[PDB]
Each structure stands twice: as C-alpha cells, then as structure tokens.
Symmetry: C5
Subunit: 206 residues, 5 copies
C-alpha cells in the first residue's frame, strides 16, 4: 500500500528519459490532436500566423506501470522525468512557447498523457482569411528523429467541438478543423516519417 511519494520514487528509478519505450520491435504509437484556443496575429502578406493550442499527446510506456491495487492509480509527473516523443511542427517558424506547467499524467497501467498549451508561429496559407470561405492553415507535426518503425503518429479519435475551447474574444473564428495522418519518405533519409496534418479553416470575424 504505497502512497504518491513511493509511486514517484519508483518512476525515477525505472524511467529512462532518453530511452524510447518500444515493445519488442513495434513502434511506440503516439496520438496527437490539437485543440485550438486562439489565433492571435495573422499576416496575409507574409503568410504567417500565431496560434495557441493544446497539444494532446498520449502514448504507453510499460516501464512506468505500477501496482495500484491499494494505492493512487494516477499521478502528475514532470516531463523531465519521462520519455516524451520528440515531436516538432515542420512549418513552425518559432520555438514552441509552452505556457503551462510541464507535467504529464501517468496511469498505473503506463498510459501517459501530456497536453501542454502552446503558442507558436507558423508559415502557412493565409490567403483569403478576409473572405467568407476563409483561409486554411495546415500544420504538420511528427517525430523529428524517429521514423515509422520506432514512432507512429495518428489523429486522436476524439472529435470535440472544433472551438469548444476556442476564445470567443479572438478577432477570428474557426470555420472547421480536419486532421489527416501521413507517412512520408524524404530524399534526405531512407526511412519514412509519420506526421499528422491539421487543417485550420478560419476567417476574420464580421
């Protein structure tokens, strides 16, 4: 019957932040889905935008699992104590600005959830943001160094209200958001890398 202190202590002794938790020779299945919170500074002339979004990220890591028969079955853990997938947005033109406490939730079964609220600038198509149809800014996110056999990424099944969390005070409104998985091979490299492309159709209010 251990408490949270013991659950945290066993996580640091067994957890290897630098070691991807693959099972045998299977890829670590990572789920990525964005929940837009705000659109702050659009520029149609430069095709750049400033977005704020929650980056819901989940994966399994057995090396963390613990017996919660008679103890807390879930805890908040600092990401520096866990292996976290090395995701990056291909068309982001600034480092992600993590606005929230960098803590993830870890379940006794090893399921991990990490959902930081991020503000980041992207290079995308802003043409038409000032029309009825609007603009569609696509954002691609995938593992930076782990190819398809080590990390697989797919859009979460969840499909909440596109703007269920979006700021009603933004100068913009979300028309629609679609997610689409991809598996690409680049000439630079022999292996294929997976990514999830999120298409944000939005327009200036009026």
């Amino acid at each position: 019957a251990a408490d949270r202190a013991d659950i945290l202590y066993n996580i640091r002794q067994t957890s290897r932040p630098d070691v991807i938790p693959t099972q045998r020779d299977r890829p670590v299945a990572v789920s990525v889905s964005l929940k837009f919170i705000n659109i702050l500074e659009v520029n149609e002339i430069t095709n750049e935008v400033d977005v704020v979004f929650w980056q819901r990220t989940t994966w399994s890591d057995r090396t963390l699992a613990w017996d919660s028969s008679h103890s807390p079955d879930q805890v908040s853990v600092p990401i520096s104590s866990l292996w976290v997938p090395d995701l990056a947005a291909y068309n982001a033109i600034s480092k992600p600005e993590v606005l929230t406490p960098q803590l993830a939730r870890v379940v006794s079964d090893g399921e991990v959830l990490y959902m930081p609220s991020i503000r980041q600038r992207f290079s995308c198509d802003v043409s038409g943001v000032d029309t009825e149809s609007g603009a569609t800014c696509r954002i691609k996110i995938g593992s930076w160094t782990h190819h398809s056999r080590e990390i697989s990424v797919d859009p979460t099944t969840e499909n909440s209200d596109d703007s269920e969390y979006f700021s009603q005070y933004s100068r913009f409104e979300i028309l629609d958001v679609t997610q689409k998985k991809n598996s690409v091979t680049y000439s630079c490299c022999p292996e294929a890398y997976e990514d999830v492309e999120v298409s944000l159709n939005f327009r200036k209010k009026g």
Copy 2:
C-alpha cells in the same frame, strides 16, 4: 532549540517538491487572490491586455511542519525546495513573467504563502475600455493537471481596496474586481477541474 539553518535543512530532508501533499484522500486546498498592480497595454481591436498583479497563493503542507517552541516560526524558502500547485491562467497568451524573487514563506505549522508579482498578457473582453462603464476582463486560473479531488481552488475573501496597490500612473483605473469559484468538466477529460475567475472592470482615465 534549532535555528533558521536547521529549519531549512530539515525541509530539504522531508519536502517532496514533486509530490502533492494530500492529507487522507482529500484535495489540497489552495487559495488564489489577485491584487492588481498595473494595466500596461490594452488593445480593444485585438482584445488583449497586459497586466501586473500579485498572485497571493496559500495552501498547507504538513510535511514541512517543525517545532517552533524554541526557534523561529517562519522562514523564506525558494519555491524550488517546495511542492507548489501547478496553476495556470487559461486565457493567458504569454508565459508569466515573475518580477520578484521566487521565495515562499513557510510557517511552522505547515502553512505556505507564495505571492509573486506577475506581468502577463491575456486574451479577454476589452470592449468598452474607453467608456464610463469600462471593459470587463475575466482571468481564469486553476490547476493545469490536478483535478477537483486532488486540488481545489477558492477565492480569498480578503477585505481590502481593489486599487489599494494599483499604480496611480497607469493610463487606466480599476472600477471593480470580483472573484468567483468554478468547477468544470471538459469534453477532453473525465474528471473535473476547478478554477477561480477574476473579473477586472477597468477603463481609461478621463
């Protein structure tokens, strides 16, 4: 018959900065109260504002208690040596800029007070800022990863003037500040999360 050195040393020997100090299976009660110091940048067109405030924060941690019968009963402690609630402002569009030494005040019975002065940018209703009625900007703050059964937040009904510490050189002025407590279940997640909503009614001086 200890001194401040021993008090600090002991705290390092029992404090678990990454372990939420829950008593029994009950939530840690955190009190949040904002004292506005300044309103630096307001943009009605973008509905964005820059505010400086003291975030009076209190909670209890019995793992820090000590016998002060023959020693001081209070000491300043760097927050990095203590567990601190993972609070985040939901509508913040910038990371908080802590303008003061990051030290908390710990009392012998375990009571902790951390009151950092913060400059942060928010996304809120700025409409009417130039009218006599002014604008009403709501700031939502709560635990980012600890649900209602782990952390509960409540407003500090402290009796004092809202503009008691507000700068007299700001281009704006405070008309009224109210603080209400909320509890919300989001579609993203199973448990409920609490937050304190602080409503700042202010306007440009005449």
Copy 3:
C-alpha cells in the same frame, strides 16, 4: 597562510544561500544606493521609462569572515554561492537585465558588496519631462519576503555629483536625485516591510 582558492572553497562550504544571516534577534542591515548611468526610452503618454543604474548593495555575513592576517583580504565571489537580500523594485514592469558579471566582493570581516549595473523598465511619473522643471520618477526597492525584523534597508549617499557617471550621450539629463527611507505595512500581511525610495528628477536635454 591561505590563498584565494582556500578562501573561496571555504566560503562555498560555509555560506548558505538560502539562509538569511541574521545575528541574534536583530535584522540584517542592508544598504542600498542607486547611481544612474542612462535614461534610454521615456514615454510620457504611458508613464514608462527605461533606466540603467548601478545598485550598490552592502550587508554583513560574519560567518563568512576569516583570519586574513596571513592571506588575501578580499575575494570576488559569484552571488549564487552567497546569500543575497531578496530585493525587488515594487514599481518595475520588467525583470532586471543585469549587464555586469554577477560577482560580489567579500571582505575578510564578512562585509559583502554587490554592485550590478542594471537596465530595467519602470512605471512612474513621467509628466513634465519636456519642461524646464522636468519629471520626477520615483523608484521603490525593498525586501520582497523579509519583514522589518529580518531585513532592514537604508539609503547610502556619496559625496559626488549625481551625474558623475551619467551618459553624456543620453537624450536626457539629471536635475537631481534624493533617497528617502520607509516602513510600509500592507493589509496583506501583519508585519511591516522597509523600502528605499529613490527620486529621479530628469528632463529631455535642451
């Protein structure tokens, strides 16, 4: 017979950065003095100014003391290895940008001197900066978490022109500088906190 290496090693092992060096039941006496170096960007519309100054800060930590009858008398020491008063500028609207190496000077008797050059933005009265009488910007600095019985702050003065180190290439000039001492009691807390208030009377150069 000891060298600097011995002295600096001893200082690191005995000095406790998180323990205020109070002696007996009396407060640590801290002296503070500002020597203005520049005025970079003033804004009368927003009552905001950007200043560069040397903050001469001194205090005692007798535990650091050592017999220098047969070894160095003084040594430069990184402030992170020393306890330093948690001073804060109450009306500052940006964090201090320390321009100089963060080293303090420790004399064998335990006297500590720290004089960083700092650029910082403040919210103060800028009205009249374009007039012959100029504006008077007041800066308030004092311990953030240590009350009057743990830390004391007092203004230091030098028999030297207020503009002796001021930039001749600045668009502004110094008319006068005065420093008063205060002991304010805030409704937030029971004890009183001291502060040094420095008044800067400056104006745009003809």
Copy 4:
C-alpha cells in the same frame, strides 16, 4: 543481447562531449549541407535576411561503435551526451534559434547525424532580390575553434531539389543553391580554418 537502454547508457558512459574524437593524428571530417525551409525576412536596404534551414551535419566517432548483431544499430541521442563540432556561421547576426528537438542519430558503426532546423539572421548580399536573377546570399559555416588539422569540413553532394523542403508559402523562391569549401588563414591566427560557403540565389515572387 542488447536493447536501446544498454546502448544509450554505454554511449553516455564512453562519449566525451568536451573531447574532439580525432583518430590517430588526422582531423575529424565533418560534412555540412543546408536544406532551406523558408526565407522570412529580407531587407535589401540593410542587407539582412531571416532564414530557416536544416543544418545537416555528419561525422564519425569510432569509440561509439557497438556490435549490432544482436541489437539495434541506430538510436536517437541528446546532443548534450555527445561531442559535436563547434560550427558557427561567420556572417550570422543572431544566435541560431534551434526549432527542433536537440537529438542526434548514432549508428552502430559510430557514424553520427545531427540535423537541427534552425532559424537565424544573416548579413549577406540582398541586392537584386526583386530582379529576375535575384539576390545571392552567401552563408559561411565552419568550426569556430578547431583549425584544419583538427576539423575539416566538406559539402555533401545534395544532388536533389533545392526547394524540396522549401515552404510554398514563402514570399520568396529559390533559384539555385551551390556549396564550395575554403581553407582560410586570417592574420589573427597562425593555423588555417576550413569552412563551407553556401550560396543561396533567391528572389521575391511576382503577383
């Protein structure tokens, strides 16, 4: 039998981040090539540009090798656990802003690949950015403190599409990219320092 945990621990135990892995008495051969992702800011008046690019960097460190017969032959390693060349862009006017996770790939034979995506501002020729032949911005990269007898740098034959990774949404477009090596002796210092000069020929597009 070895797993990733064994390898990463061994790498971190044998790798010397502050010791250039020169073999015998030859210099470490570092390969550098840039893959342009975007051109964000251009000022023909000041001759300053803001670019985003993948700085592909490869070199060998034999001590990192391990028998991959019964184990993985490739792993991602944080660069803080490895010695990496102290490359610097001579004409850069801002610290490089690394946009991606700072991880390198280490192969069982000791081959290392580090390819960060970087946004950085440079001082180069921007004249003609609105012409048909565009401007040609030269970026010079080489080791900051290791001379030619310690580190050598060569351009990788990027015989691929120059705009393969370039953003289709940039206000600019790439016409051509060439790379050439140089070995320079400055009057400041007795030894020669090698570098790779990347020539970016680009221009503003038309409506």
Copy 5:
C-alpha cells in the same frame, strides 16, 4: 603518454573557475582588443548603435599548464571549466549576445585565448555618422570587480587591417580604430579599475 581526454581531465581537476590565477602577488595581465565584424542598427537620434565584434581576450593561467613533450600542446575547452576575466562594457545597454560556441583555446604553457563574436548595443557618440569625417563611438571595457592590483587590461596594438573581418555588406564602413588604456577610481570604491577604450570611427557608405 597523454591525449586530449587526459589533458581535459587534468584541467577539470586543478582548474578553479572561481579563482583568479594571480602569479605571486602580481595582477593577471589581460589583453583585450576588438575586431569589428559589422555595424547594424545606428540611431543618431538616441546615440545608440548595434555592433558585432570578436572580443579577443588573452591571459595566462599556470594552473592549466602541462607537459606537451609527447602530447597535443593546445585544446579547445568550454569556458565553464576555466577562470575567465570578468570584463564588462560600461556603456553597453544590453547583455552581450554571444553568437559563437563558448570555447577557449588553452596552450600547454597555460596561455589562454577566448575570442567570442558578440552582438551588443552601446550608448555612444553617433553624431556625424552621415558626414565624411563620420561618427566616433567609444567603447569602454574593463574588469568589473577586480582592481588594478588583481587585473590589468592592456590593448593589443597589432597591425591588422581595421576591416579585415568587417562585413562588406554593412551600410557602414570603418574609417579608423584607436585604443587607449585607463585606470579609474570610482567614488564607490577605494581601488582603481583599469579599462581599455576602443574608439570606433565609422560612417554611412557614400
């Protein structure tokens, strides 16, 4: 029988980053000379300029020496493993932005060379920048906490074209560069602190 790993190993044992390496009771002789790379943001209205420059800095530290009879006689070392003089630019209005890897070069005889390329903004005389005689910007650099008896700073009057490294794409050009050594006694303190003043004569092109 020794290699680079051995050399670095010995250095990170005998070397004390916090201890100035004085010989006997004499001061550490430090050579400082700036190689201008670019002039970027000139403002004649505010007497401010953004300059990029290699800050060649040399000095000796015998505690680093080693027998190079059968081993390399030079190695690149992170400055965090070495004592480095605490130089500061008096009229700089921003912290130094070090653009290059922070490595110093150490020779077997204990000679050290540290030459980072720095971008920094200064407050200096910009008047005349648009004339033929041009503006003359004076930059002052010296130890911050080490007085004449601990550190002396002298310029390296080497015949190196003032524009060898200067960017041919700058909007400005270097007419001439001169150096001058000084020794000052600031009202704040008894000792005298040496500095080198580098006068930069430049002008707009054409």
